[PDB]
Design a protein around this ligand. Structure first.
Ligand SMILES: [Mg+2]
Ligand SMILES: [Zn+2]
Ligand SMILES: [Zn+2]
Ligand SMILES: [Zn+2]
Lengths: 91, 69, 512, 335, 110, 113, 285
């Protein structure tokens, strides 16, 4: 995992602010969490960066919950099975 | 104030010269620099004892005299 | 009308012009009267339209109490334009790269078109453009220098003629810059340099600055600097027009300079790029907003105590004191299958364990303490009963520092009904997960009270899952100390007395 | 103007298991309880027609409640009042304090703030139904509110009329768009027949710009429209017929088009002069044939709807007597 | 001429609606076995819904919502579905994969 | 008052902290519902409203009928987004520095027909 | 501690996806988690017998000669191919490592030997009568199971339809395929019955499926924690043994330091010829 992340872009990248900025540049919120919030925010604003919400840090900073683990998949009610096996409350 | 020798239970009013009391351990008004509270503290499971040569240890169980070896 | 359920899928950052401040402002700060009686003074930095921080009055904008109103922004019309403290460098670069007389650039767009967009403007600024002459203007581009006494003052020395570039003049300069120039230079439409000058700053929502200090100093709060800014803006003449080669009265210059400094300190005071309350100083550092509030949180329904050994507790069990089991609660929704099991808890109340503390009526949307409940009160389907923690309820057991995914595990609670015991008790073999020792170490325990959380804890975070280490794939738990020695002694073939044998009574007594 | 619109929204399902027993019935019922009778997306919603598209009943994932949510794309019947619309029935609610408020009593709810600057408005008395015209400003459909908000004044017909310069010929593809507008007039014209011919005559004469005595009705095959003072003895062109002939290759309308005040606005008559031999104070409007036809066609509907609504509002002599002052007010400005 | 910057709201264009694309049953490539996360989520959602409304298809009676949900999952009576989102193409589609828990394999949850 | 979270420690009768490390552990375990509970229900968790049309914090109140977006006078399309008062304060502070935060709500998705 | 936080934020966004890959917002970081798609806590060390055997020993031990059929020659040839591949790959690992040495013990998701032994003991029936048809059926079953083994990374629908398998998934299943071939060789499973063989295969497949990494796993955080924990032991231990200090080298690794700043650099050069390497005086020259 360590090596694959550090060699993802075809060049050895660090596990530091410089390395993160090269692997996930658009992820303004994640880079803000790491360090230097004000500089990252200023560069994002002037750049007009669009930050997709993924990972752990960005949803957490946006007040949401990361879409991982139990939240990776989606649960949708089975209308057909419910329709055929259940009765409406207003009976 | 409150009478000296009064059980100062949690969530009670002890007017001092500080009414709130939320320590959760009952106390007693020792004096009324005033409003002294004293606790009758024994050795309790979880208290820490140590020999003179370090060896700190936590009291994990208490047994009656009949159960001791 | 109802607001549907949605989740954020992306965040777009952009520079906010004074037009945005005008559009999004509920109120417009006009007066500097701090307070009009008990209620906030109208048209002041504490106007209730921006929000509420007390239980006496609600949010005028959205009619919510202190909780449930998120804070509602305002406006402040600045008589003299103000440069944005957060983008000084961008202003400098744009001034370097742009003709002052006209909006046409003084550099070659093709000279930098090859570079990736974020770098284009930086490269143009770095390139020396001190003596070039504009193609459509015979004017020669001046030399731009930053004053060494402040972070927000720009001087234009033209052939040795030193002149200060006031914010209104800079606004005029950037107003003529065409959109094609910004696009070619790399910046987007929303980052047009004209935005970098504000004639109406935004008053933060009252939520950001709840320290109103009502109810009767040495402490310094964000409200003080905002009040000072309002007062100085009032001092400034409302209709002030500056020209590139125009002089201004000395007092006016000092007033504008101090307003600029006030705004700069309000936004960034201690930021590097004691009584310094700044909006941006709140973000960085371990004690900053991001690291202390957003990443990590203080929580309710949690307990902490010293740990101790207990050979009679299983590996996946924790001994919980009775008093803590009474303090922490578990919320159960009354239903037809639940009612019979929940009735004993309701009847016991707070008198005898197991009991309850509160009940939430579905019809009334209110919670009632069990003790003061009236006899007419019953348990109807749909109510929530907050019962006590009983043996068998799962709980989250945590030891800090949390260096491994085993640092938090779910243990089935065993309630120690002896009032004397006041420590969490776990099997010694369980200490491997948490890297713990019964030497005064403390651990955190919280009982999930929501059905989803309880299901997650019991099915996912059970310590049974952490038996095999993720780090090494080998076992984590096993016999230690007395258990190892006793295993050796029991399995030992010969003892000093003779052959290692026992009679039927003691063989049975081993398994009891 | 009643019309069909398509909306998109998300519904919170508080009992997903019970909701899914009958999605269609539950979905429609939820939409009606939320949107019907409220302004939404710059429109007023009258009744939900149906659901075009929906999504499965998703389960909320950012909170621990088991509730679900559903995306739905439904088409409703909405009313969008434009500028210069004529509202027949506007009951005054509050005239005192130089403030004149009146809520319409028609299918499309709206609250009209009538300015006190005009003297004619001050003549209105609380509790009196008085025709009103919406001002040039657009109607504010504040979301969530149960009725639109606009400003208008007592309808006093104005002699100032506008000519439109016609340069481009009407494209057959464009014709198809206009035929829909033509279809609206046909229904309105048919409805006008049902109303007694006596009541329409009184009101149309009252709101005619020029005073006219009882004369033979300028009957048309499409409708029995009334007469008026001919300007330059010109021959009006039946626009409704024109589109009917436009479908038969008769799409020659390059000449100028206008409807001088001497024309009864309700009747589908257009004075298409070859040239601008009009007393038009303002210069002709350089507009496409579609823009001109749409401008003039919608004008017919506005007035035709006005007359039919007037008859229903005032159907007994008691009411007409109650508003004699209102009727007399038009006479003062009558020319 | 001089240009006044518009507000960010005017430039903003909200994301266009997407159209769910159910991959045909025989073109599915994801695992036919519930992951521990998916089974946990199914049980939790069903338990909360039981708390909201007690109707169930389970014949045996239990006094707590969690047990009813777990036994519904194990006996293949849970009325929910699992939707796996594979890709969100830029054209405006949300390609997903609908799986029926009543037919998939159930992990070892005990 | 600022963040809405429990006060600090036993001295103030507040709560106990679940720092970043505990959150890393919980995320590694995949216990997202536990995170929801502890960090929203037992913490400053709140409901925030954002206009889908402009991605800006709208105004919504059910009891007192309010459905209003400042930027979109009409055309307002408000959706409720679960958030945390700390996050809302964070975004408000970022706005206070003239950094315009625009939240792009997830698009509505419909079945083919 | 400090490097722990930096690594956590560096690897945070690596989350497994529905293809079992590791990606950061659809950008691949791994074609398959750990190149095997397995959970770190579902592995147990197992020994491969054929790795160290000689040619003659391997033929004597694994070449079944009960039936004169080409199928058994083919099976033995497959065993030989797998042995040679294991040697070539892991001999190469030696040639770019300072001291890493080839071993015949690897961590695998399923211990096939344990399954076979437990089935034998539970349902012991003695030496079964030589049934020629039964042996061929078992060999065909194991061959088909090995062929379909990569499908554990796909549903059972694709296995039934026999759709094409990705090459990377085939590689991921290669190691377990070789282990199954070793532990289910016709010589080894000579007493197993066809029903017992099917039960063994079903148990193997179930255990393999139960070991795959879950879809929403935050594997980056797991890696960060698992690699940060041993570092502290190195930090203190290196201090006692103390360039090469506890903190100097890890910072060099995790900061992508240039060669100029790479203190404590080293090389392992080897002599031009296999013959001259034995002599130490030539090496010293
Ligand atoms: Mg210790
Ligand atoms: Zn509010
Ligand atoms: Zn110029
Ligand atoms: Zn909006």
């Amino acid at each position: 995992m360590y090596a694959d992340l550090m060699t993802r872009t075809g060049q050895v990248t660090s596990l530091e602010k410089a390395g993160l900025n090269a692997r996930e540049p658009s992820n303004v919120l994640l880079r803000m969490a790491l360090s230097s919030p004000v500089q990252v925010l200023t560069d994002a604003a002037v750049d007009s960066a669009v930050n997709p919400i993924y990972g752990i840090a960005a949803p957490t900073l946006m007040g949401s919950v990361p879409r991982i683990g139990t939240m990776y998949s989606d649960i949708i009610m089975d209308e057909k099975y419910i329709t055929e096996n259940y009765k409406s409350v207003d009976s | 104030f409150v009478p000296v020798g009064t059980v100062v239970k949690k969530g009670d009013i002890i007017i001092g010269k500080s009414v709130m009391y939320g320590f959760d351990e009952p106390a007693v008004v020792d004096a009324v620099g005033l409003m002294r509270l004293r606790y009758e503290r024994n050795l309790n499971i979880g208290d820490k004892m140590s020999s003179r040569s370090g060896n700190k240890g936590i009291a994990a169980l208490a047994l009656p005299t009949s159960d001791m070896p | 009308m109802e607001a549907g359920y949605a989740e954020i899928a992306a965040v777009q950052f952009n520079i906010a012009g004074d037009n945005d401040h005008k559009r999004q402002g509920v109120m417009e700060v006009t007066i500097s009267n701090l307070f009009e009686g008990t209620l906030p003074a109208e048209g002041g930095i504490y106007d209730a339209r921006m929000g509420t921080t007390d239980h006496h009055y609600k949010c005028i904008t959205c009619s919510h109490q202190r909780k449930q109103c998120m804070g509602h922004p305002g406006i402040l019309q600045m008589h003299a334009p103000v440069l944005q403290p957060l983008f000084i460098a961008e202003i400098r670069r744009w001034l370097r790269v742009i003709c002052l007389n006209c909006g046409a650039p003084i550099v070659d767009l093709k000279r930098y078109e090859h570079l990736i967009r974020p770098k284009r403007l930086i490269e143009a600024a770095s390139s020396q453009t001190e003596g070039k002459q504009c193609y459509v203007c015979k004017a020669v581009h001046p030399k731009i220098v930053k004053d060494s006494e402040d972070y927000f003052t720009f001087w234009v020395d033209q052939q040795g003629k030193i002149d200060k570039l006031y914010p209104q003049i800079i606004r005029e300069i950037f107003s003529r810059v065409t959109y094609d120039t910004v696009v070619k230079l790399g910046r987007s439409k929303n980052s047009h340099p004209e935005k970098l000058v504000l004639k109406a700053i935004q008053i933060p929502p009252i939520s950001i600055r709840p320290g109103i200090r009502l109810g009767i100093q040495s402490f310094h709060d964000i409200n003080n600097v905002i009040q000072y800014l309002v007062r100085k803006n009032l001092l400034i003449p409302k209709d002030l027009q500056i020209v590139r080669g125009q002089k201004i009265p000395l007092n006016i210059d000092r007033n504008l300079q101090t307003i600029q400094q006030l705004y700069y300190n309000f936004l960034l005071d201690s930021v590097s790029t004691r009584p310094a309350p700044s909006i941006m100083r709140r973000l960085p550092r371990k004690e900053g907003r991001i690291r202390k509030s957003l990443l990590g949180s203080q929580v309710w329904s949690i307990s902490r105590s010293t740990i101790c050994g207990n050979s009679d507790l299983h590996l996946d069990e924790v001994g919980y004191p009775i008093s803590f089991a009474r303090t922490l609660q578990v919320a159960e929704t009354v239903q037809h299958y639940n009612i019979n099991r929940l009735m004993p808890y309701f009847l016991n109340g707070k008198r005898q364990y197991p009991g309850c503390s509160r009940v939430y009526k579905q019809i009334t949307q209110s919670v009632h303490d069990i003790e003061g409940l009236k006899q007419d009160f019953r348990l109807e389907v749909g109510d929530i009963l907050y019962r006590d923690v009983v043996t068998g309820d799962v709980a989250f057991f945590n030891r800090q520092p949390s260096l491994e995914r085993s640092s938090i595990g779910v243990h089935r609670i065993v309630v120690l009904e002896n009032p004397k015991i006041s420590t969490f008790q776990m099997n010694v073999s369980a200490c491997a997960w948490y890297n713990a020792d019964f030497d005064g170490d403390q651990m955190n325990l919280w009982v999930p009270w929501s059905v989803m959380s309880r299901v997650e804890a019991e099915l996912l975070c059970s310590v049974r899952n952490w038996f095999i280490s993720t780090k090494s794939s080998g076992p984590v738990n096993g016999q230690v100390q007395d258990s190892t020695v006793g295993s050796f002694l029991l399995t030992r073939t010969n003892t000093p007395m003779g052959k290692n044998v026992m009679n039927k009574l003691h063989a049975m007594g081993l398994f009891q | 103007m009643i019309d069909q619109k398509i909306f998109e929204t998300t519904l919170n399902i508080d009992d997903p298991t019970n909701f899914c027993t009958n999605v269609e019935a539950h979905l429609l019922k939820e939409l009606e309880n939320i949107y019907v009778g409220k302004c939404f997306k710059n429109s007023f919603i009258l009744n939900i027609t149906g659901v075009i598209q929906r999504s499965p009943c998703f389960i909320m994932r950012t909170n621990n409640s088991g509730r679900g949510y559903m995306h739905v794309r439904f088409s409703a019947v909405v009313s969008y009042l434009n500028a210069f619309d004529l509202i027949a029935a506007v009951k005054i609610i509050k005239n005192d304090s130089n403030i004149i408020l009146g809520e319409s009593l028609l299918t499309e709810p709206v609250t009209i703030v009538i300015p006190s600057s005009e003297s004619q408005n001050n003549v209105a008395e609380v509790g009196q139904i008085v025709p009103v015209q919406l001002a040039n400003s657009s109607v504010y459909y504040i979301p969530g509110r149960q009725q639109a908000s606009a400003t208008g004044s007592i309808f006093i017909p104005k002699h100032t009329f506008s000519v439109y310069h016609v340069q481009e010929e009407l494209t057959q593809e464009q014709a198809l768009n206009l035929t829909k507008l033509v279809n609206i007039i046909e229904m309105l014209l048919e409805s006008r027949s049902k109303k007694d011919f006596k009541q329409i005559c009184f009101f149309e004469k009252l709101y005619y710009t020029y005073s006219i005595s009882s004369d033979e009705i300028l009957d048309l095959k499409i409708w029995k429209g009334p007469k008026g003072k001919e300007m330059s003895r010109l021959k009006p062109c039946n626009v409704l017929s024109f589109l009917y002939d436009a479908l038969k290759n008769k799409s020659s309308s390059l000449g100028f088009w206008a409807r001088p005040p001497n024309l009864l606005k309700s009747s589908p008559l257009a004075y298409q002069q070859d040239q601008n031999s009009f007393n038009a104070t303002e210069l002709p409007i350089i507009c496409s044939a579609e823009v001109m036809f749409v401008t003039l066609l919608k004008e017919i509907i506005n007035y035709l709807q006005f007359m039919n609504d007037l008859c229903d509002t005032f159907n007994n002599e008691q009411l007409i007597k109650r508003h004699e002052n209102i009727w007399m007010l038009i006479e003062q400005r009558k020319i | 001429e001089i240009v006044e910057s518009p507000s960010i709201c005017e430039g903003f264009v909200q994301a266009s609606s997407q159209t769910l694309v159910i991959i045909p049953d025989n073109e599915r490539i994801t695992s036919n076995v519930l992951t521990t996360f998916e089974a946990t989520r199914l049980v939790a959602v069903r338990a909360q819904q039981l708390a909201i409304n007690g109707s169930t298809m389970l014949k045996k009676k239990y006094s707590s919502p969690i047990d009813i949900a777990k036994q519904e999952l194990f006996n293949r009576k849970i009325p929910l579905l699992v939707m796996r989102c594979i890709k969100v193409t830029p054209e405006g589609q949300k390609i997903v994969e609908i799986w029926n828990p009543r037919e998939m394999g159930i992990p070892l949850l005990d | 008052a600022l963040t809405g979270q429990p006060l600090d420690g036993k001295r103030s009768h507040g709560g106990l902290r679940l720092g970043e490390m505990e959150h890393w552990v919980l995320t590694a375990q995949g216990a997202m519902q536990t995170i929801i509970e502890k960090s929203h229900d037992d913490s400053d968790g709140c409901i925030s409203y954002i206009c889908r049309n402009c991605g800006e914090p709208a105004i919504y109140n059910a009891s007192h009928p309010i459905y209003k977006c400042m930027n979109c006078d009409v055309q307002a399309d408000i959706g409720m987004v679960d958030s945390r008062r700390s996050s809302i304060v964070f975004q408000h502070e970022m706005r206070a520095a003239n950094v315009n935060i625009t939240s792009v709500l997830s698009p509505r998705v419909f079945q083919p027909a | 501690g400090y490097a722990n936080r930096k690594a956590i934020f560096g690897l945070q966004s690596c989350i497994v996806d529905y293809y079992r890959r590791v990606s950061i917002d659809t950008r691949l970081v791994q074609q398959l988690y750990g190149e095997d798609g397995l959970d770190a806590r579902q592995l147990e060390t197992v020994r491969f017998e054929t790795i160290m055997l000689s040619d003659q020993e391997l033929e004597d031990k694994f070449k079944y000669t009960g039936i004169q059929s080409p199928l058994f020659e083919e099976e033995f040839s497959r065993l030989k191919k797998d042995r040679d591949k294991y040697r070539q790959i892991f001999l190469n690992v030696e040639n770019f490592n300072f001291s890493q040495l080839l071993t015949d013990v690897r961590q695998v998701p399923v211990n096939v030997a344990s399954i076979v032994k437990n089935i034998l003991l539970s349902s012991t029936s003695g030496v079964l009568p030589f049934d020629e048809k039964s042996i061929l059926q078992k060999y065909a079953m194991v061959k088909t199971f090995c062929k379909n083994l990569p499908y554990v990374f796909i549903n059972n629908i694709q296995e039934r339809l026999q759709t094409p398998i990705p090459v990377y998934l085939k590689r991921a299943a290669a190691l377990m395929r070789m282990l199954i071939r070793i532990e289910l060789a016709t010589v080894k499973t000579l007493n197993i019955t066809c029903e017992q063989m099917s039960a063994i295969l079903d148990l193997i497949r179930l255990q393999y499926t139960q070991s795959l990494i879950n879809y929403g796993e935050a594997v980056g955080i797991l890696a960060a924690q698992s690699v940060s924990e041993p570092l502290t032991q190195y930090m203190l231990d290196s201090h006692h043994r103390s360039n090469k200090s506890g903190i100097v080298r890890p910072q060099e690794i995790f900061s992508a330091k240039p060669v100029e700043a790479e203190q404590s650099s080293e090389m392992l050069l080897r002599l031009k010829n296999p013959e001259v390497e034995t002599n130490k005086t030539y090496a010293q020259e």
